[PDB]
Amino acid sequence: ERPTFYRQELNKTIWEVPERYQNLSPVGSGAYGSVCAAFDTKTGHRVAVKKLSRPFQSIIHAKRTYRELRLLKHMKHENVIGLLDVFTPARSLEEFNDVYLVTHLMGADLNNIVKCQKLTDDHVQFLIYQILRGLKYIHSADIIHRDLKPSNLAVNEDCELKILDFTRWYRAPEIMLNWMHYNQTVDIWSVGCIMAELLTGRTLFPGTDHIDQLKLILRLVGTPGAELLKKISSESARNYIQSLAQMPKMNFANVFIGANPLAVDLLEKMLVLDSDKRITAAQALAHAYFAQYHDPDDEPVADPYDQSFESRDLLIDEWKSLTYDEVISFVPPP
Ligand SMILES: C[S@](=O)c1ccc(-c2nc(-c3ccc(F)cc3)c(-c3ccncc3)[nH]2)cc1
């Protein structure tokens, strides 16, 4: 009922994993934690093992750890990371310190993409399609990514694309500053900046700070109009913006010159300052740009997700217990 674990130290980090996972090779590390490629002897496929960094060092971390485990256990969709296994070496809650997450190995991300490129750039269509397909699903459970960027989006040798861990270059201007009650469509903005970057090769808005970032966004999409200024509840921001010289909305065809005109039409519908006017994932899939891949019979919505815990205010030992309960109750895919 409990497997056999084995110790291992990979550049100054303790890896204690069940013996079914072999040939652990580091692929990267950061704030999220440490990830290793590995061979799963049970299923026989290549997996990625993530060890959470300092999972219970504060109420923020402990709650963040619980959040990630709850989200990842909920996601059943081809364009979103699924959990194959979650485990801890600890035999009880008393000594429960570390958490490991297991998903199928993804060779690269949207920064890399050399396995998918062709001269026509018909790869872009398939890559953005998969993002929107996974966003529709995520957004259907009232989940918003917020920090969507090319390193968040994994890709295989087959150019299958998946989202994971839910600069400021791709951040929707409404959440850089906070004018209105920011909705799902913050992510559609990030897809805009990503798509554009895949079509030109250059970062669309490579701003050096929150000042420079809003300067570069307004250069392209023009300063807020009469009807958008109205809906900004923050005086700081309404002062910030009205104090700046009026910029006109540029012609997208002239900016994105030599790119599929169907792509330009989609960009124009993604990069609007007004979140209420901006295209949804569900709508964007139906855009003619994706006519090849689109199918409303195989673009599914997620089951309802219980986000009631986000409001709740508990101690680290309480989150840890709630986290521990989610590891024990885990069941893999059939
Ligand atoms: C800091 S940057 O945004 C960033 C954050 C997380 C990850 C990142 N997190 C994972 C990862 C691994 C296992 C899990 F169970 C969950 C997530 C992977 C992963 C998954 C499969 N094959 C290769 C790598 N990459 C990569 C980059």
Ligand SMILES: [Mg+2]
């Ligand atoms: Mg990685």
Ligand SMILES: [Mg+2]
């Ligand atoms: Mg999934």
